[PDB]
Design a protein around this ligand. Sequence first.
Ligand code: A1BAM
Ligand code: CL
Length: 167
Amino acid sequence: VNSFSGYLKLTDNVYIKNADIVEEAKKVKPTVVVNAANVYLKHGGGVAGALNKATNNAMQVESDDYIATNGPLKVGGSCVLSGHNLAKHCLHVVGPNVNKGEDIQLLKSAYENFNQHEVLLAPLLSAGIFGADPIHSLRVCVDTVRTNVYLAVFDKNLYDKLVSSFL
Ligand SMILES: Cc1c[nH]c2ncnc(NCC3(O)CCCCC3)c12
Ligand SMILES: [Cl-]
């Protein structure tokens, strides 16, 4: 039993809700919140900008130190950093950016990072400002993630479509 509320069950381990991941984070304080990161951990907009703003830019400050030490992430890769006031940990995961010509096949690799954590609050990777179809992202998620994932989908019409077209 966990504290996630009002999620529609899609499969054994995947749950979905029309919600702002920032608000789900502020209310639940999960062990892991997933950020839809880019390779530079530049949290300017989208999920990343929203999470970072909610941390009063502390996420960006921590991220800049991480990059200065370690260099950029790989597309499809991840790192674990602090969750600040939102979660215990933030798993920064880089899905491919279709607008940059990045290989959509890397979306599966991106979702594989979730399997290192028993329970996560997450967005649909590569969707939104990253350019991919959220329907496709959801299918890759369901077919790749084996741990318990709670998805917050920001857009109501897209959520309804994600729900309606699933089975
Ligand atoms: C921008 C933003 C702020 N707070 C959020 N919480 C969740 N998702 C977000 N954007 C990505 C997505 O949900 C958009 C609809 C289709 C699936 C992907 C955001
Ligand atoms: Cl977005």
